[PDB]
Amino acid sequence: ENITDMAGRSVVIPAKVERILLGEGRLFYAVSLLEGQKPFDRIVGWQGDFRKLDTQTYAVYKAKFPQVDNIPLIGNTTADSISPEKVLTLNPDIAIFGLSSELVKQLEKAGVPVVFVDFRTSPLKNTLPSMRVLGKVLHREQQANDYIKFYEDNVRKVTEITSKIPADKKPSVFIELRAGAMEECCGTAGKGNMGDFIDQAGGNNMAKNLLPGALGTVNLEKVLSTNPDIYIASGGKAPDNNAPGVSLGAQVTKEQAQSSLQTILDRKGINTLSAVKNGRSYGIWHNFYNSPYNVLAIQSFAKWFYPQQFADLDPNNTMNSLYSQFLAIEPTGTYWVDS
Numbered sequence: 001e002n003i004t005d006m007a008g009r010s011v012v013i014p015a016k017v018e019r020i021l022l023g024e025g026r027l028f029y030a031v032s033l034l035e036g037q038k039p040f041d042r043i044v045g046w047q048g049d050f051r052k053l054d055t056q057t058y059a060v061y062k063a064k065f066p067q068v069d070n071i072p073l074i075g076n077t078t079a080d081s082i083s084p085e086k087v088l089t090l091n092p093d094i095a096i097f098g099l100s101s102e103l104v105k106q107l108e109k110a111g112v113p114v115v116f117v118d119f120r121t122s123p124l125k126n127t128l129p130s131m132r133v134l135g136k137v138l139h140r141e142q143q144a145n146d147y148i149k150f151y152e153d154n155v156r157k158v159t160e161i162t163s164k165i166p167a168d169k170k171p172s173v174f175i176e177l178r179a180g181a182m183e184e185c186c187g188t189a190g191k192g193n194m195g196d197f198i199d200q201a202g203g204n205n206m207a208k209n210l211l212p213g214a215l216g217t218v219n220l221e222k223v224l225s226t227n228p229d230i231y232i233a234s235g236g237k238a239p240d241n242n243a244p245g246v247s248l249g250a251q252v253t254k255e256q257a258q259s260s261l262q263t264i265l266d267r268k269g270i271n272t273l274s275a276v277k278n279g280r281s282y283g284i285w286h287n288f289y290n291s292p293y294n295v296l297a298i299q300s301f302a303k304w305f306y307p308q309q310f311a312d313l314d315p316n317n318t319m320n321s322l323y324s325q326f327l328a329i330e331p332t333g334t335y336w337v338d339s
């Protein structure tokens with residue numbers, strides 16, 4: 001009847017859930033795992049981050065489910081169709097938020113149950129507990145628990161190997177989040193976020209000691225001085241976009257991915273790293289930084305870090321299984337890339 005969310009708040013599970021508000025649109029990644037062939041049927045509103053910041057995934061859904069464009073966008077901008085203060089008109093049974101608000105207050109003041117999850121700041125600790133909570137409060141425990149089993153299995157395949165690797169034998173690693181996005185450079189993950197995936201994949205994240213939190217910045221000069229064994233760039237850029245950025249996602253091929261990475265690797269400063277010269281330079285889909293599908297990032301990283309140990313591991317296969325079992329769309333495009 002009650003469950004504890006990732007804020008440690010006790011929440012009363014509603015007996016009927018037909019109407020789900022997503023405080024962050026990209027929480028749809030999690031919800032989608034639960035809704036089988038009816039992904040949108042219970043979504044009554046969402047913030048626009050999925051539609052606006054994941055145009056590629058949105059577009060694939062829109063192809064098969066045009067109704068996605070009718071889902072109200074909650075926010076205060078001209079791109080939004082319903083302001084926080086009026087979200088009660090949507091009659092949500094429950095509202096889902098990330099840990100990372102006037103909206104939350106408005107919903108709590110209306111007696112709407114609010115559940116906090118987290119795939120962003122501490123994914124290693126919080127991914128699976130988040131999914132468990134979601135299975136319970138959205139009445140999809142079978143789907144949650146099967147996903148939990150699938151994720152555990154697929155993570156173990158890595159960690160049963162990477163946990164036995166001595167630290168001195170581990171590659172040093174630097175991930176540049178949204179490489180080529182802002183003008184200043186080297187937004188990264190430290191004690192959390194994609195850091196967790198580096199850790200689980202047997203890497204040594206050079207930003208871990210440089211940052212107090214999960215997310216932060218390391219100046220290029222420090223990246224260049226440290227000169228890690230491995231360089232990773234995250235991005236989710238449209239393959240039709242000339243702005244610098246790694247093009248990855250549902251609508252990107254390998255060749256477009258490689259090409260856009262190459263532009264990122266050719267940047268002044270970055271092009272002097274040994275990792276770039278050695279070709280130990282890689283691209284990862286940015287939205288794995290806030291998604292329960294992050295098992296695929298862990299598997300990708302492991303393959304880059306220990307290519308021999310993970311010769312037979314194929315994240316594209318892992319992804320295929322995830323889609324087959326849980327999702328109403330087919331897997332397409334490119335979510336990781338090598339030089």
Ligand SMILES: O=C(O)CN(CC(=O)O)CC(=O)O
Binds near residue numbers: 049053
């Ligand atoms: O999440 C957002 O609203 C915007 N992002 C970029 C992105 O996620 O594409 C910055 C950040 O989360 O630091």
Ligand SMILES: [Fe+3]
């Ligand atoms: Fe972001």
